[PDB]
């Protein structure tokens, strides 16, 4: 819709400006752009539409940008069910727990990995805390991440 | 307490204990410690004060220097603004990168002058300790 | 184990065997020949016959993989590497020529007729088979019986054995040994066979003791697992043998017993002269029977009536009514050139008849020559109603006889479950085939298809039910057709049935009305071909039955299906002196009996016995490979074994299945057994690669490995999606800062440049210096 495309516009600027204002954005940021308009595509997802592994590789106008966002819209988003399901498969106890160490492993080691920094990051952000045994309720965590930075 | 020092200072600097600072006053004490400035340095160093250097025109030029700056809290935050995880440290390559080619790009010298002091140990540059050092 | 009791029961094997040289090549005499390849040439393989050492070529795709000496005389064929018509025929024939006549074919048993008595049924042997698990002891029919018992007991459900095979195979002998077995682990039961066989068996070319009725006998069990009763059901007795018997065949056994002098005392009670070749109704075909002593069989039959608990009058009522028949056919006649109605040609024999049936000889011949509103009969209309009467009496005797023997067995004791045994009469093709045969054959079909259903159609269904994993397999084994050609709405029988109700009808409107409906509209129905056996009497059409092509002559099929006895004589006998005598079409009726039988069967855990006729000569220990092989084909043995080896080894309890495979269609999950019904449904999973189950799912082979594939995939994605979610959260979190960081950087950039320039201020330098 218009108020929508206007939103793409709004954000496109903040970005195209920061990597040198000139009406073009580094295809390596196309991810973060859309990540700002709510959506959270997967790296596999982004490259599919035009994203790049590195800066410099290439820049893009707003003309080519419209469809990348048309694209990253029709792509699957994870529900609470799904995040709850997957996390259960690591719980031997079955009581909604996990250890810090393991959670760390899941994030950094499995699936489209996550740097060790983004991890200590979101941990601190969501202010996730372990008990005496060093375990955490993965249910709470999933809920925050899902919540947003500003709830 | 910034004043208490200023005075006691002006005292040690004002050698001929005449309540005034003269080209000989400066030259005097400098040499008693480390290398001192050349006549030209001493000259324009005084010309920086309209009239005689009583403990007043002293505190005047010193205060007009340290004026036009912010807080130790205001700066410690402009820093934690890149410290997502809230660890109270910035990764050295990061900060260096920010200052170097972002915003109002620094220069190699600004870069060297700055890090010659900087408290970096373990890859992480502690912006707290450094905010203090640069401030109070 | 050194046990003498295993002489003809336990298998008594190395070198010269190249798994690439040695193979099975088609043969005309032996069905398959042991060959050793010599040279390939595209498709033309050149092998050497190990036997005669001759040579020949054979299409490459006609060679069959031979099994290694590792499986010589194997007890269970499902355990062989190769289960092909040549490996099977070889294994059997191997065992057979060594005394071993029992072999498992996977889940069911194979019995090859011995044509000789074997010391394998003794009480010594029965002791050893008791409570033994099929793999624990050599193959034997006792094992099949013993196991059905254990199942009924532990599983708490009815069991059942369908003993099938061709005519002269071993269906009856084996049915009896099963009962004799179950009885031994009672006296009257065993004793009901001698009387029923005397009245419902006869020499035939094929069988000297051919059963001419279908037999289903259920054996009830009580709360301590012991025999507590039993009943018998019979089907379609050959009413026709009574008055007629093709050459080389005899009438029922009794008639010959009755004229031997086993009990001279009875001669005057029946009014018979001890000469069978004296009575037309029983000397048409054969008289004597190699290996059947009518003298002793009569005695034992008499002896058996006693044990059954038959009052002396009762058992003399039987004997007389049947000897009476021996007279109905002695009543000669004549016409009287004019009108012909017909007149008698004496009365001596027609009285003995009225006498034995306790009715007036006068009132008889009367209601027989001018049935009453009156309506006289000609000279043949009579001789044929005579036969109509003989046949109809005998059909009542036999029926009453069974009701009575059940009287003696339906002990009102307490019943839990039972074990039935089905012995139905088998396939038979003669020189001339008519309605009688179509009936037997339609019967036998039928059954085969049951095995096909429960064996292939069935197996996979349960896999689905339980909700396991699997992919379908078409064994291509269906006769619904043949079945359909005969039984369905417009079928053969239905045509005949609607043709009887018309008095106008005849052997030609029936014959034409048939082609009219199925010629070219059903390929099982084919114009009569060409002779495959001398003396091959007339044929009007052919049917392609599971075990053979049968040329049927439909002449006389209209009267054969609509019975017809002077409703007059039925009045005479209705009020006869003898107490016994005093006491819907055939097609429809039988079709119904049969359907009811089948219905009763389906509610069972079937164990199958497969009989096999070794040759067409009735001689023992001799094999005719072609014939054998041929049976190992129309019976479905091989296939019957593939699934036992092939099958669906997976198995999952819906409770543990839902927990592990919900994550594969969660947008369809609002009960563990339905949830899975959904998941596997969502995935648009092939009904083949899996099966139902009450408490568990059955997935064909490999499938579960593949589900754990899809399972991971999803688990990886989801993990990525939550990492994506974490990537998007952190980005959006730092969005204010793109303004915030632009400021927070200008602070630091402008405020370091200050502290930088302040240190480059002489005053400050010198100041800092003084400091201490």
The percent helix, strand, coil of chain C (3-state, each to 5) is 50, 15, 40
- Domain closes at, from A53, A71, A89: A71
Q: Are B59 and B65 in contact (CB under 8 A)?
A: no
- CATH code assigned at B100: 1.10.238.10
Give ∠ CA C90-C65-C615 in degrees, rounded to 5: 25
Count of CB atoms within 10 A of residue B131's CB? Answer: 22
Count of CB atoms within 10 A of residue C767's CB? Answer: 17
Q: Are A129 and A141 in contact (CB under 8 A)?
A: no
Q: How many residues does chain C have?
A: 772
- C768 close contact with B: CB closer than 8 A: no
Q: Are B123 and C762 in contact (CB under 8 A)?
A: no
Among residues C332, C237, C357, C235, the alpha carbon closest in space to that of C280 is found at: C332
Ligand-binding annotation for C285, yes or no, is no
Residue spans of alpha helices (H) in C152-293: 171-184, 187-199, 253-257, 267-270
Among residues C387, C382, C415, the alpha carbon closest in space to that of C563 is found at: C387
- B101 close contact with A: CB closer than 8 A: no
C720 and C759 assigned to the same domain:
no
DSSP codes, C58-123: EEGGG-B-PPPGGGTT-SBGGGSS--SHHHHHHHHHHHHTTT--EEEETTEEEEE--SS--TTSSH
CB under 8 Å, gap of 24 or more: what pairs does C357-361 form?
C357/C321, C357/C324, C357/C573, C357/C576, C357/C577, C357/C578, C357/C581, C358/C576, C358/C577, C358/C578, C358/C581, C358/C582, C359/C572, C359/C573, C359/C576, C359/C577, C359/C581, C360/C572
Q: How far apart are CA C1 and CA C84, in angstroms?
A: 32
Shortest CB distance from C724 goes to which of A36, A41, A150? A41
Q: Are A105 and C685 in contact (CB under 8 A)?
A: no
Convert C509-520 to b/e letters by CB count within 10 Å (16 or more is b). Answer: ebbeebeebbee
Helix (H, G, I), strand (E, B) or coil at C698: strand
Q: Are C587 and C561 in contact (CB under 8 A)?
A: yes
Q: How far apart are CA C467 and CA C465, in angstroms?
A: 5
Six token digits for residue B18: 């005449």
Query: How many B-C residue pairs are in contact by the CB < 8 A criterion?
Result: 76
Six token digits for residue B40: 């030209």
Q: How far apart are CA C173 and CA C611, in angstroms?
A: 10
Range of the domain at C742: 737-770
C671 and C757 assigned to the same domain:
no
- CATH code assigned at C448: 1.20.58.530
Q: Are C366 and C391 in contact (CB under 8 A)?
A: no
A44 and A99 assigned to the same domain:
no
Residues 93-122 of chain A with CB under 8 A from chain B are 117, 120-121
- B41 close contact with C: CB closer than 8 A: yes
Among residues A80, A76, A4, A70, the alpha carbon closest in space to that of A41 is found at: A76
Burial (CB count <10 Å: 0-12, 13-18, 19+), residue C738: middle
Does residue A66 lie within any of the structural domains? yes
Main-chain phi, psi angles of C542, to 5 degrees: -130, 150
The DSSP H or E segment spanning A25 is: strand A25-26
Shortest CB distance from A42 goes to which of C666, C715, C724? C724
The DSSP H or E segment spanning B59 is: helix B55-63
Main-chain phi, psi angles of B108, to 5 degrees: -55, -45
The percent helix, strand, coil of chain A (3-state, each to 5) is 55, 5, 40
Main-chain phi, psi angles of C435, to 5 degrees: -50, -40
Q: How far apart are CA C47 and CA C57, in angstroms?
A: 6
B59 and B87 assigned to the same domain:
no
Phi-psi map region of B22: left, alpha, beta (phi>0 left; psi -120 to 50 alpha): beta
Cα C108 to the chain's mean position, in Å?
A: 11
Q: How far apart are CA C506 and CA C511, in angstroms?
A: 9
Dihedral sign for Cα C150, C151, C156, C159, please.
negative
Q: How far apart are CA A27 and CA A35, in angstroms?
A: 14
Q: Are B70 and B135 in contact (CB under 8 A)?
A: no
Convert C410-444 to b/e letters by CB count within 10 Å (16 or more is b). Answer: eeeeeebbbbbbbbbbbbbbbeebbbbbbbbbbbb
Bridge-based pairing state of the strands A59-60 and B90-91 = unpaired
Does residue C552 lie within any of the structural domains? yes
A118 and A135 assigned to the same domain:
yes
Burial (CB count <10 Å: 0-12, 13-18, 19+), residue C35: buried
A24 and A41 assigned to the same domain:
yes
Q: Which chain B residues have a beta carbon less than 8 Å from that of C740?
A: 81
Range of the domain at B29: 2-63
B38 and B86 assigned to the same domain:
no
Number of domains in chain C: 3
Six token digits for residue C364: 């008889």
Dihedral sign for Cα C299, C302, C307, C312, please.
negative
Q: Are C67 and C87 in contact (CB under 8 A)?
A: yes
Give ∠ CA B104-B108-B113 in degrees, rounded to 5: 95
- Domain closes at, from A10, A44, A71: A71
- Domain closes at, from B63, B84, B114: B63
B44 and B80 assigned to the same domain:
no
Does residue A103 lie within any of the structural domains? yes
Count of CB atoms within 10 A of residue B5's CB? Answer: 12
Q: Which chain C residues have a beta carbon less than 8 Å from that of A111?
A: 716-717, 719-720, 723
Does residue C592 lie within any of the structural domains? no
A92 and A45 assigned to the same domain:
no
- B98 close contact with C: CB closer than 8 A: yes
Six token digits for residue A29: 């940021």
Catalytic positions of C, please?
Answer: 167-168, 172, 207, 210-211, 426, 428
Six token digits for residue C757: 């320039």
Ligand-binding annotation for C696, yes or no, is no
B126 and B83 assigned to the same domain:
yes
Experimental approach: cryo-EM
Bridge-based pairing state of the strands C227-235 and C214-221 = antiparallel
DSSP codes, C516-572: HHHTTT-TTEE-----SSTT----SEEEEETTEEEEE--TTHHHHHS----TTHHHH
B28 and B50 assigned to the same domain:
yes
Q: How far apart are CA C96 and CA C99, in angstroms?
A: 5
Phi-psi map region of C52: left, alpha, beta (phi>0 left; psi -120 to 50 alpha): alpha
Q: How far apart are CA C284 and CA C300, in angstroms?
A: 26
Cα dihedral A89, A92, A98, A100, rounded to 10, equals -100
Q: How far apart are CA C697 and CA C402, in angstroms?
A: 46
C512 and C571 assigned to the same domain:
yes
CB contact under 8 A, A125 and B87: no
Number of domains in chain A: 2
Q: What one-character DSSP code corresponds to residue A77?
A: -
Q: Are C95 and C11 in contact (CB under 8 A)?
A: yes
CB contact under 8 A, C756 and B113: yes
The owner of tokens 């336990």 is: C10
Q: How far apart are CA C174 and CA C153, in angstroms?
A: 22
Residue spans of alpha helices (H) in C683-736: 703-733
Q: Find the closest chain C residue to B6 by CA distance.
A: C767
Give ∠ CA A98-A100-A104 in degrees, rounded to 5: 105
Count of CB atoms within 10 A of residue B116's CB? Answer: 7
A6 and A65 assigned to the same domain:
yes
The owner of tokens 């688990």 is: C715
Q: How far apart are CA C481 and CA C474, in angstroms?
A: 17
Shortest CB distance from B37 goes to which of C750, C758, C762? C762
Convert A49-86 to b/e letters by CB count within 10 Å (16 or more is b). Answer: bbbbeeeeeebbeeeebeebbebbeebeebeeebbebb
Q: Are C683 and C665 in contact (CB under 8 A)?
A: yes
The owner of tokens 């000397």 is: C283
Does residue A151 lie within any of the structural domains? no
| Start-to-end C-alpha separation, chain B | 11
Cα dihedral C389, C392, C393, C397, rounded to 10, equals 170
Helix (H, G, I), strand (E, B) or coil at C46: strand
Q: How far apart are CA C772 and CA C751, in angstroms?
A: 26
- B2 close contact with C: CB closer than 8 A: no
- C743 close contact with B: CB closer than 8 A: yes
B58 and B27 assigned to the same domain:
yes
Cα B74 to the chain's mean position, in Å?
A: 18
Chains near C (3 or more Cβ pairs under 8 Å): A, B
Six token digits for residue C771: 């400091």
Q: What one-character DSSP code corresponds to residue C280?
A: G
- Domain closes at, from B43, B63, B83: B63
Phi-psi map region of C293: left, alpha, beta (phi>0 left; psi -120 to 50 alpha): beta
- CATH code assigned at A25: 1.10.238.10
Q: Which of C763, C764, C765, C771 has the highest number of chain B CBs within 10 A, making it the mutation to test binding with B? A: C763
C742 and C699 assigned to the same domain:
no
A85 and A142 assigned to the same domain:
yes
Main-chain phi, psi angles of C388, to 5 degrees: -60, -35
Q: How far apart are CA C172 and CA C424, in angstroms?
A: 9
- Domain closes at, from A31, A54, A71: A71
Burial (CB count <10 Å: 0-12, 13-18, 19+), residue C396: middle
Range of the domain at A140: 80-146
Q: How far apart are CA C744 and CA C479, in angstroms?
A: 87
Task: Name beta bridge partners: A63.
Answer: none
C511 and C565 assigned to the same domain:
yes
């Amino acid at each position: 819709s218009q108020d929508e495309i206007d939103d793409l516009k709004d954000v496109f600027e903040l970005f195209d400006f920061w990597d040198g204002r000139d009406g073009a954005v580094d295809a390596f940021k196309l991810g973060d752009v859309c990540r700002c308009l709510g959506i959270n595509p997967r790296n596999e997802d982004v490259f599919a539409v035009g994203g790049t592994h590195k800066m410099g590789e290439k820049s893009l106008p707003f003309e080519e940008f419209l469809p990348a966002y048309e694209g990253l819209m029709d792509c699957e988003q994870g529900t609470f069910a799904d995040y709850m399901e997957a996390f259960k498969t690591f719980d031997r106890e079955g009581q909604g727990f996990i250890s810090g160490a393991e959670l760390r492993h899941v994030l950094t080691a499995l699936g489209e990995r996550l740097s060790d920094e983004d991890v200590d990051e979101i941990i601190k952000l969501t202010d996730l805390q372990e008990d005496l045994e060093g375990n955490v309720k993965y249910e709470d965590f999933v809920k925050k991440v899902m919540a947003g930075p500003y709830p | 307490k910034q004043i208490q020092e200023m005075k006691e200072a002006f005292s040690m600097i004002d050698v001929d204990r005449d309540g005034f600072v003269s080209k000989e006053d400066i030259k005097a004490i400098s040499e008693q410690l480390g290398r001192a400035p050349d006549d030209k340095e001493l000259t324009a160093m005084l010309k920086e004060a309209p009239g005689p250097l009583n403990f007043t025109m002293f505190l005047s030029i010193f205060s007009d220097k340290l004026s036009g700056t912010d807080s130790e809290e205001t700066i410690r935050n402009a820093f934690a603004m890149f410290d997502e995880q809230e660890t109270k440290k910035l990764n050295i390559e990061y900060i260096k990168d920010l200052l170097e080619n972002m915003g109002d790009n620094f220069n190699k010298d600004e870069m060297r002058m700055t890090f010659k002091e900087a408290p970096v140990e373990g890859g992480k540059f502690d912006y707290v300790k450094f905010t203090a050092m640069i401030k109070g | 184990f050194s046990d003498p009791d295993f002489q003809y029961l336990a298998v008594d094997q190395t070198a010269a065997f190249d798994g690439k040289k040695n193979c099975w090549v088609p043969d005309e005499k032996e069905g398959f020949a042991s060959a050793e390849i010599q040279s390939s040439k595209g498709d033309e393989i050149t092998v050497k016959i190990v036997a005669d050492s001759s040579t020949r070529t054979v299409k490459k795709d006609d060679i069959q993989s031979m099994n290694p000496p590792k499986f010589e005389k194997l007890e269970d064929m499902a355990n062989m590497t190769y289960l092909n018509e040549a490996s099977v025929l070889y294994n059997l024939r191997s065992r057979y020529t060594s005394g071993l006549i029992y072999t498992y074919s996977g889940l069911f048993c194979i019995a090859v007729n011995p044509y000789r008595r074997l010391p394998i049924y003794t009480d010594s042997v029965i002791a050893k088979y008791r409570g033994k698990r099929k793999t624990e002891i050599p193959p034997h029919l006792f094992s099949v019986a013993d196991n059905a018992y254990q199942n009924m007991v532990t599983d708490r459900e009815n069991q059942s054995c369908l003993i099938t095979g061709e005519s002269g195979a071993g269906k009856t002998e084996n049915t009896k040994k099963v009962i004799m077995y179950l009885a031994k682990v009672e006296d009257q039961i065993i004793q009901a066979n001698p009387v029923l066989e005397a009245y419902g068996n006869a020499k035939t070319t094929r069988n000297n003791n051919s059963s001419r009725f279908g037999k289903f006998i259920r054996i009830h069990f009580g709360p301590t697992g012991k025999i507590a009763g039993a009943d018998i059901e019979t089907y379609l007795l050959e009413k026709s043998r009574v008055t007629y018997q093709q050459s080389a065949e005899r009438n029922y056994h009794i008639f010959y017993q009755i004229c031997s002098n086993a009990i001279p005392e009875l001669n005057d009670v029946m009014l018979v002269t001890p000469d069978s070749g004296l009575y037309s109704f029983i000397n048409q075909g054969c008289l004597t029977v190699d290996n059947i002593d009518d003298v002793e069989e009569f005695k034992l039959c008499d002896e058996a009536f006693d044990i059954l608990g038959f009052t002396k009058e009762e058992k003399q009522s039987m004997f007389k009514c049947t000897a009476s028949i021996l007279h109905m056919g002695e009543m000669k006649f004549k016409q009287r050139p004019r009108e012909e109605q017909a007149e008698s040609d004496g009365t001596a024999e027609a009285e003995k008849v009225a006498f034995l049936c306790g009715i007036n000889a006068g009132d008889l011949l009367k209601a027989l020559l001018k049935p009453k509103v009156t309506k006289g009969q000609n000279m043949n209309q009579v001789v044929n109603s005579v036969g109509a009467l003989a046949k109809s009496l005998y059909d009542r005797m036999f029926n009453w006889l069974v009701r009575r023997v059940n009287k003696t067995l339906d002990t009102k004791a307490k019943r839990n479950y039972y074990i039935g045994v089905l012995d139905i009469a088998g396939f038979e093709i003669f020189d001339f085939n008519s309605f009688e045969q179509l009936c037997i054959n339609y019967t036998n079909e039928r059954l085969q298809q049951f095995f096909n259903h429960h064996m292939f159609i069935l197996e996979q269904e349960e896999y689905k039910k339980e909700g396991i994993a699997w992919e379908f397999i078409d064994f291509g084994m269906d006769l619904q057709m043949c079945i359909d050609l005969i039984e369905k709405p417009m079928g053969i029988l239905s045509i005949l049935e609607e043709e009887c109700m018309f008095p106008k009808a005849d052997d030609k409107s029936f014959q034409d009305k048939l082609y009219q409906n199925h010629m070219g509209k059903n390929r099982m129905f084919t114009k009569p071909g060409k002779p495959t056996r001398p003396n091959q009497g007339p044929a009007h059409f052919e049917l392609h039955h599971y075990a053979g092509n049968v040329p049927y002559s439909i002449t006389g099929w209209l009267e054969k299906n609509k019975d017809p006895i002077n409703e007059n004589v039925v009045a005479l006998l209705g009020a006869s002196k003898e107490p016994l005598v005093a006491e819907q079409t055939i097609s429809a009726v039988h079709r119904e009996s049969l359907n009811k039988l089948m219905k009763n069967l389906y509610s069972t855990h079937p164990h199958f016995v497969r009989c096999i006729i070794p040759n067409e000569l009735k001689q023992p220990g001799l094999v005719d490979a072609e014939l054998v092989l041929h049976q190992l084909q129309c019976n479905g043995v091989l296939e019957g074994i593939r699934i036992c080896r092939k099958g669906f080894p997976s198995r999952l309890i819906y409770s543990e299945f839902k927990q592990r495979y919900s994550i594969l269609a969660p947008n369809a999950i609002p009960d563990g057994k339905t949830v899975s019904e959904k998941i596997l449904a969502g995935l648009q999973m092939d009904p083949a690669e899996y099966r139902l189950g009450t408490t568990k799912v059955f997935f064909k082979a490999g499938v579960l490995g593949n589900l754990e594939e899809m399972r991971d995939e999803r688990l990886s994605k989801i993990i990525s999606m939550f990492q994506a979610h974490i990537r998007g959260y952190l980005i959006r979190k730092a969005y204010k800062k793109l303004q915030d960081q632009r400021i927070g950087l200008s602070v630091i950039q402008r405020n370091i440049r200050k502290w930088l320039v302040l240190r480059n201020w002489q005053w400050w330098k010198l100041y800092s210096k003084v400091k201490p």
